[PDB]
């Protein structure tokens, strides 16, 4: 049912739209270059959507990973 | 079977020595239900062992048992269409029983004349690390290595 910690509750004050702020945005990406669900971030829906959009933008730029590789497994 | 776990019968321990394993072995040896004939046979075998290989005739038996014991066994299962020889682990009691059975078979699958003597010989062989029962055990083990294939079909 998802509840270990949340990526909104572990992270403090940050603007969502700024894709350049990459390491703060590196926390909402998975271990593989994949987006974590609403039940992992902790956001409201709108916020989540915005975040997703920002991530996409970043990807288009290149900063954040596009798809990566899981370790151990 | 379906409901309960169908308990193992706890045998009355031996009249001369004092071990249930021995009793079980005696029972296994016994055909037609003649315990006194085959118990006598077992005793004769023991005596023979004592005579030839200068040892107590319980320890030797134990050794033999240990030798013939399987840990990896092979079952039959139909999955998809074809039958696959499935390797799986044995519970101790069952393994012991199997070993006993094998020993009995070996005793009956020998070339010499009298019942006790044959049994004794087989026991000695088992103790050594050869014989018939031991060979069978080895074969079984091998089968649970050429077919460790279909181990993921866990029962």
């Amino acid at each position: 049912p998802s509840r270990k910690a949340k990526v909104k509750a572990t992270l403090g004050e940050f603007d969502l739209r700024d894709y350049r702020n990459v390491e703060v945005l590196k926390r909402f990406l998975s271990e593989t270059g994949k987006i974590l669900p609403r039940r992992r971030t902790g956001l409201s829906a709108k916020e989540q959507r915005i975040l997703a959009k920002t991530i996409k933008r970043a990807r288009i730029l290149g900063l954040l990973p596009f798809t990566e590789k899981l370790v151990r497994k | 079977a379906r409901r309960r776990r169908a308990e193992v019968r706890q045998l009355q321990p031996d009249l001369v020595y004092g071990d249930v394993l021995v009793t079980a072995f005696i029972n296994k040896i016994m055909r037609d239900g003649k315990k006194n004939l085959a118990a006598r046979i077992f005793y004769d075998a023991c005596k023979i062992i004592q005579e030839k290989t200068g040892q107590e005739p319980l320890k030797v038996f134990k050794q033999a048992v240990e030798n013939v014991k399987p840990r990896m066994e092979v079952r039959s299962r139909r999955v998809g269409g074809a039958n696959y020889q499935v390797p799986m682990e044995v519970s101790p009691r069952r393994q012991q029983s199997l070993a006993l059975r094998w020993l009995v078979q070996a005793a009956n699958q020998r070339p010499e004349r009298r019942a006790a003597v044959r049994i004794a010989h087989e026991l000695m062989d088992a103790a050594e690390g050869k014989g018939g029962a031991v060979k069978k055990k080895e074969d079984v083990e091998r089968m649970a290595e050429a077919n460790r294939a279909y181990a993921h079909y866990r029962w």
């Binding site: 590789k69 899981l70 370790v71 151990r72 497994k73 | 460790r148 279909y150 993921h152």
Partner: protein
């Protein structure tokens, strides 16, 4: 007769056959092992045991070229990809990391009608 001691271990895993390639750190392969290589043909070709066998064979081949320092990458999934991995771990080859890199399209073309019905 070339020799390397190091490299990667690309396990392409399909349900019909799990194929294992071993490569040098550059990405130029030394050997590979498959299912028809362990004799097996048809159904068993993709049975976990076959995969394991293939893995073992590949390891052996690598050893015939001095290889130990082994990075492992799996692609797709077959019956035993995990089994193959296990086999490799067992073999005696320095397993650095086992990494998943499935050739999953970012919503690619139309799949074949078998891999359709998924919606």
């Amino acid at each position: 007769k070339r020799q390397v001691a190091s490299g990667r271990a690309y396990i392409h895993a399909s349900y019909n056959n799990t194929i294992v390639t071993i490569t040098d750190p550059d990405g130029n392969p030394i050997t590979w092992s498959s299912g028809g290589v362990i004799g097996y043909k048809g159904s068993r070709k993709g049975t976990p045991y076959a995969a394991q066998l293939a893995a073992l064979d590949a390891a052996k081949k690598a050893m015939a070229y001095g290889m130990q320092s082994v990075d492992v990458i799996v692609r797709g999934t077959g019956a035993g990809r995990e089994q193959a991995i296990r086999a490799l771990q067992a073999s005696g080859l320095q397993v650095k990391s086992i990494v998943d890199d499935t050739p999953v399209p970012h919503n690619g073309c139309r799949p074949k009608k078998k891999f359709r019905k998924a919606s």
